Amino acid sequence: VSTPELKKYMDKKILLNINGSRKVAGILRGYDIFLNVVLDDAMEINGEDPANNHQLGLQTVIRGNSIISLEALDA
Amino acid sequence: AAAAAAAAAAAAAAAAAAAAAAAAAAAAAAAAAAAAAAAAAAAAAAAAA
Amino acid sequence: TRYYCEYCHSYLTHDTLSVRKSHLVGKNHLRITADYYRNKARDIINKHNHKRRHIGKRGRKERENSSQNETLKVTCLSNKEKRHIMHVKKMNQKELAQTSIDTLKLLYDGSPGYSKVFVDANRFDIGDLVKASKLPQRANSRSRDETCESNPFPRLNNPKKLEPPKILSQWSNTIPKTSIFYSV
Amino acid sequence: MVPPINCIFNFLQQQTPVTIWLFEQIGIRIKGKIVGFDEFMNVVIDEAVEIPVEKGTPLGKILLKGDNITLITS
Amino acid sequence: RPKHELSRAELEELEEFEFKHGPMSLINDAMVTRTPVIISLRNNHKIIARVKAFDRHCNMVLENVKELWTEKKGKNVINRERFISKLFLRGDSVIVVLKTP
Amino acid sequence: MSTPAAEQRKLVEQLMGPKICKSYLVGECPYDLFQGTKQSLGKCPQMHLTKHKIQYEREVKQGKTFPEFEREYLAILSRFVNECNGQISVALQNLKHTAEERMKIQQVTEELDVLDVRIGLMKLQELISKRKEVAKRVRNITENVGQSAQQKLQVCEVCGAYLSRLDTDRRLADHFLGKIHLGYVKMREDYDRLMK
Amino acid sequence: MKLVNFLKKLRNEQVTIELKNGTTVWGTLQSVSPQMNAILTDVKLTLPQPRLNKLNSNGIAMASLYLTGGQQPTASDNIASLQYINIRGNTIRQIILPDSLNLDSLLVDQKQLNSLRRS
Amino acid sequence: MNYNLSKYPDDVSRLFKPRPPLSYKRPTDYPYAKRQTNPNITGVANLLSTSLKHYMEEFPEGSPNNHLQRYEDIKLSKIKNAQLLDRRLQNPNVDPHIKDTDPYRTIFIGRLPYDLDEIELQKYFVKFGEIEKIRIVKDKITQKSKGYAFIVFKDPISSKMAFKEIGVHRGIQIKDRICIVDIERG
Amino acid sequence: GIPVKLLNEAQGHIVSLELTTGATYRGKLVESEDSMNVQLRDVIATEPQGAVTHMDQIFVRGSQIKFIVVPDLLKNAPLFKKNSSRPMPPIR
RNA sequence: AAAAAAAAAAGGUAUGUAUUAA
RNA sequence: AUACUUACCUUAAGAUAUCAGAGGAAAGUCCUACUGAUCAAACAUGCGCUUCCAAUAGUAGAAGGACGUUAAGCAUUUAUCAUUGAACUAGUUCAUUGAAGUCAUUGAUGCAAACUCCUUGGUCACACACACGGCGCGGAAGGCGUG
RNA sequence: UUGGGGCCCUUUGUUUCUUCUGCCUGGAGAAGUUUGACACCAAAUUCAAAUUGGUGUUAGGGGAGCUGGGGCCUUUCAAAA
Ligand SMILES: [Zn+2]
Ligand SMILES: [Zn+2]
Ligand SMILES: [Zn+2]
């Protein structure tokens, strides 16, 4: 019905937690009413910052159902 | 003028908003000049009679 | 649908995030609502508890033990008096609400890091928020970069001596009458 | 702005291969060529293989439900 | 064609079709013919029963229900059976339902 | 509209099922800009479908680049540019004058005999003349401040809407970021795009 | 057809509402909401004992059961008795209705006939 | 509070003070990542279908469905309605209550009062032209007037004039009732 | 419904959250929608295991929210008036 | 033998400008 | 409160107990301050209906709390990972480099008591009356019944 | 009308329905009661009144009248045995 308001967030590098365990960081591109969020330059954060972190793809889309909290690390 | 309008307005529209503002100020100055010329013409018409 | 704003009591037709967001931020709605919670908040202090009394039958022992004790006199002010004294007491409570002694900020005014801490606009935790807290400023400073190199000697006819400690108005006759030394 | 399902339509026509993570309970991730999709984000994948979490077996042209979708990653 | 376009009676004909011709026709033909059905829930135990009624959400009213549930701890298994005369089953728990010969 | 799955089915049907319309590599169309504003009305011709848009914007990468769309897009846009200019003309006709100059003629009357006095008495003569003409100029200035009090503003060529000089900038930003003004801003730029 | 409209005619009957937790509720039934929210009156709600040489029961259902305030201290097994429990609809798994009532009278929906009688 | 990023001034903002931070309690439930419903559901076995026979021999015959017979009653009743309509449909050159002269001059009156008379209808119908034949529809089981009639007139043009005049406006007032009028339609 | 309208009435005030994942986000509420998904400003976070951090901005999905703690003085707020008298709606 | 036209703005919220007293 | 300027926006749909019978405009619909049955709400009103409503013939007691003290109470269990070098048994100590690292160890978990303080009640009337388990006036909360 | 006794006065802004007067050697007196009055909160100026916007109070007890409901008694009438 109503579109979520991410309007200040887009183009800013954002960390968001996928399900319980995972945390993905990427530059937010677009979003929809289900809060499906597509972002680019995705990286999967882990305990060891440079080591266990591995990039996903040039463009990644996320189902809004697996989104828990969304924090922007940015202005 | 930038610090005053920068807070509420988004930064991406701040540039075009600024340019439109400067253009509006210039148009105001032009209108002022035209009014001054009209005043001069009125003074000359009052002096001729 | 229609969004009824019960603070202002005025309807707004066909609610939408834009129009509703504009009304809620509106100045008039702001004054109305803020005043509303000012009243609803002053009421709980204004309202008297009026707890229920449960009176039991006084026993024969304590009536005799309390009969030998003399009866104490009670004082009751006139209506004209009690209205004024209630006004004064309430205005004193309002005073103790707003006091918030800051003197520490007055002490460190010339400290080398005074600009990074007590200015509170340029801080880290609270710094970024104040910018978004600035009003829309519709129509009609102490930068952080300061160093110790400014004001090298804190006293050159600059400072005012520290303000004297306050005193209660009631007991103001309690003060020692004369000072120990001669001030100018 | 790039709406997410627009991006998925750019996965359909650009014929780029995608890896897609499922829910954390199942324990497999699918990868293949996304062909077409519905409003519910349930997608048909041509030439799909299921990898447990590289010896996974090839699937086929398979319809995968959108309820179990977590990530769609190129 | 989406459902919000249709009128009040077109939804009734749509539900009549879906029950008569469709997946749930497996249950409907099972209700009329008095054929016992096997139902697996997501709670991981299975009822052998006879369907007196069913519904869109798959919730269904049953008669002569026989519930079969096994449990194991450290690979020690026991099979337990529980009989019920009449029952009402909410449809979100079920996964697979088969029609016995 | 009632549920998100319905809206999303509508969007996906816009993605997946001559028509011309939207044309130029940047946004535009005359209609899409002004929806919800007083100016433009409802259904518009043909179909601005995201499928056709993606095909054309991908042909921009293909670079087939045959600006027949732009040659129809000048016939579409420049007409609206001319409509806005015309509305500007109508507003300029409306604003400036009213019953107005009647009292201003009155002001002129209060000047007339004044400016005459000198020629009748012709040092104190020319002095009374100077003070008289000064009073006349003051009366005219008051009249201009009165007509401004009725309407003090300048019509912006872009959006054909009125902008007061005394409301400064921070109020004008609301008018500059609106759909009407920003839309006309884009359409002017599109005319410049098509003149090259 | 909404089969929940059947449960609304089961009012004032002894019933067990067997929930998703495994918790079972015996009680007298009151009005059932269209979302299948089921409100009961005098209820004894408990957990079954899987035997299997001490297989730990549901850990969340024991806490939720003690936290109703209805579990009495001296109960040896795990039960609670209370008045007026209101149960959300999505929590229900099975409903065991009494053997006495006849379905042929209650399973007739008046809207189903009303649609056919009118056409 | 210090900043109070809000519409309210400082006094209203300090009035909304929240309760102190919530104390930390260790979770007693299963972490969100570990949350699942029961996996490894045993499917319906060949051994389960083998255990089916114990249930089948115990309850071989299901209880009859008497709530479905309420529907099978009404639908069969509809079919029988269609059969009665079939009995009516097979039954205008035979009828000879309707065998009066050429249908082009036959004008149909309806909604006439059951207390009406042949003279008044002869006048109201005679207003638009001369009357050739006239017939009033009465039930076959008894003489009660059905409220409709057929009037054959000397010319079809006068019958059309009567249909348009009498039937096209409000219905023609006869006795206490408004009477519709049309062509024979049969 | 009233429960969501009270959340809209809590904008610009310090609120607490409990996500169904077990965490706790206490901080100032900037935005809230009718889908209960809110965004908070200058918030202190408590992980499910107790580790506490601080983040400037956060957006959470409403489906994952468990309870929201709202400043107590909103209890007497006009939403909870049972018998209330509204004027006539404007005709449009 | 046949013939010919139509009746209309609505009203909500917010922002800026001016007026309502010794 | 009025006038002008600018911005933001506009109608999910339907219905108000059911069943049956008689009547008005073969099928169906609508309608009847029409007739019956059942259901629901409000208002009254009753039941030898059920439960509860604190000491003054004394310095008490019942219910519920403390986000109170004793209290560092008593009894338990805990304080990061990776790389390189030295010594060492055949894992241990020290030094250096990198990563993250809720605070607490007067903590956390279990066990129990004492004390202190808060909120609440008809602290009502009659009675100090040798019985086989009533028929004082009210208030609170229910169940059942009639109108 | 006076006197004596009993209990209560935390009613804590000394009976809390307002306003004004007033009280412990006392329990009082005056005016007023819903298209109204009173209390209070908020402002910016004027410069202590009002102005505009808001929240709240207008209560309890008894009796007479009138009116609704219930139980009981007496009389009159209709039906049935
Ligand atoms: Zn409002
Ligand atoms: Zn277009
Ligand atoms: Zn403009």
Curated annotation (Swiss-Prot), chain A:
Q: Which UniProt keywords apply?
A: Cytoplasm, mRNA processing, mRNA splicing, Nucleus, Ribonucleoprotein, RNA-binding, Spliceosome
GO molecular-function term, one example from the UniProt record: RNA binding
Q: Which GO terms describe its biological process?
A: 7-methylguanosine cap hypermethylation; mRNA 5'-splice site recognition; mRNA splicing, via spliceosome; spliceosomal complex assembly; spliceosomal snRNP assembly; U2-type prespliceosome assembly
Q: Which Pfam families match?
A: LSM
Matching entries from InterPro entries are given as: Lsm7/SmG-like, LSM_dom_sf, Sm, Sm_dom_euk/arc, Sm_G
Domain annotation Sm: ranges: 1-75
Where found? Nucleus; Cytoplasm
Q: Which GO terms describe its cellular component?
A: catalytic step 2 spliceosome; commitment complex; cytoplasm; nucleus; precatalytic spliceosome; SMN-Sm protein complex; spliceosomal complex; spliceosomal tri-snRNP complex
The organism's superkingdom is given as Eukaryota
PROSITE patterns (UniProt xref): SM
Miscellaneous remark of the record = Present with 1400 molecules/cell in log phase SD medium.
Role of this protein: Plays a role in pre-mRNA splicing as a core component of the spliceosomal U1, U2, U4 and U5 small nuclear ribonucleoproteins (snRNPs), the building blocks of the spliceosome.
In the record, the note on similarity to other proteins reads: Belongs to the snRNP Sm proteins family.
Subunit comment: Component of the Sm core complex, present in spliceosomal snRNP U1, U2, U4/U6 and U5. The core complex contains SMB1, SMD1, SMD2, SMD3, SME1, SMX3 and SMX2 (Sm proteins B, D1, D2, D3, E, F and G, respectively), and is probably a heptameric ring structure. SMX2 specifically interacts with SME1.
This one is known as: Small nuclear ribonucleoprotein G
- Which species expresses this protein natively? Saccharomyces cerevisiae (strain ATCC 204508 / S288c)
What gene, per UniProt, encodes this protein? SMX2
Curated annotation (Swiss-Prot), chain E:
Q: Which SMART domains does the protein's record reference?
A: Sm
**The Sm domain, residue ranges:** 24-101
Q: Which Pfam family name is an example for this entry?
A: LSM
Location in the cell: Nucleus; Cytoplasm, Cytosol
GO biological process per UniProt: 7-methylguanosine cap hypermethylation; mRNA 5'-splice site recognition; mRNA splicing, via spliceosome; spliceosomal complex assembly; spliceosomal snRNP assembly; U2-type prespliceosome assembly
What the entry lists under PANTHER family is as follows: SMALL NUCLEAR RIBONUCLEOPROTEIN SM D2 (PTHR12777)
Misc remark: Present with 799 molecules/cell in log phase SD medium.
Give the quaternary structure.
Answer: Component of the Sm core complex, present in spliceosomal snRNP U1, U2, U4/U6 and U5. The core complex contains SMB1, SMD1, SMD2, SMD3, SME1, SMX3 and SMX2 (Sm proteins B, D1, D2, D3, E, F and G, respectively), and is probably a heptameric ring structure.
Please report the name of this protein according to its UniProt entry: Small nuclear ribonucleoprotein Sm D2
Q: Give the species.
A: Saccharomyces cerevisiae (strain ATCC 204508 / S288c)
From Swiss-Prot, chain F:
Q: Which family does it belong to?
A: Belongs to the Luc7 family.
User: Cross-referenced InterPro entries, in alphabetical order?
Assistant: Luc7-rel (IPR004882)
The record's GO molecular-function terms, alphabetically, read:
mRNA binding
The GO cellular component terms are:
commitment complex; cytosol; nucleus; spliceosomal complex; U1 snRNP; U2-type prespliceosome
Q: Where in the cell is it found?
A: Nucleus
Q: What domain of life does the native source organism fall in?
A: Eukaryota
Tell me what this protein is called: Protein LUC7
Task: Answer whether the UniProt record assigns the keyword Cell division to this protein.
Answer: no
Oligomer and partners: Component of the 18S U1 snRNP particle, a subcomplex of the spliceosome.
Q: Name one Pfam family in it.
A: LUC7
* Residue runs in coiled coils: 99-145
Q: Detail the disulphide connectivity of this chain as listed in its UniProt entry.
A: none
| PANTHER family registered for this protein in UniProt | RNA-BINDING PROTEIN LUC7-RELATED
Keywords, comma-separated and alphabetical: Acetylation, Coiled coil, mRNA processing, mRNA splicing, Nucleus, Ribonucleoprotein, Spliceosome
Please tell me the species this chain comes from.
Saccharomyces cerevisiae (strain ATCC 204508 / S288c)
Q: What biological-process terms (Gene Ontology) are attached? A: mRNA 5'-splice site recognition; mRNA splice site recognition; mRNA splicing, via spliceosome
- Name the job this protein performs: Component of the U1 snRNP particle, which recognizes and binds the 5'-splice site of pre-mRNA. Together with other non-snRNP factors, U1 snRNP forms the spliceosomal commitment complex, that targets pre-mRNA to the splicing pathway.
Q: Extra notes?
A: Present with 2270 molecules/cell in log phase SD medium.
Where does this protein chiefly localize?
Answer: nucleus
From Swiss-Prot, chain H:
The reply on keyword Lipoprotein is no
Is Secreted one of the keywords?
no
Please give one Gene Ontology molecular function term for this protein.
mRNA binding
GO biological processes: mRNA 5'-splice site recognition; mRNA splicing, via spliceosome
Cite the RRM domain residue spans from the record.
105-186
Give start-end ranges for the coiled-coil region(s): none
- Consequence when changing residue 150 to L: No splicing defects. Associates with U1 snRNP
Q: Name one GO cellular component term.
A: commitment complex
* Keywords assigned: mRNA processing, mRNA splicing, Nucleus, Ribonucleoprotein, RNA-binding, Spliceosome
Q: Give the location in the cell.
A: Nucleus
Primary location group: nucleus
Biological role = Involved in nuclear mRNA splicing.
Assembly with partners or alone = Component of the spliceosome, where it is associated with snRNP U1. Binds stem loop I of U1 snRNA. Interacts with mRNA.
Q: What else is known?
A: Present with 736 molecules/cell in log phase SD medium.
Q: What protein is this chain from?
A: U1 small nuclear ribonucleoprotein 70 kDa homolog
The organism is Saccharomyces cerevisiae (strain ATCC 204508 / S288c)
Residue numbers of the full-length protein present here: 1 to 188 of 300
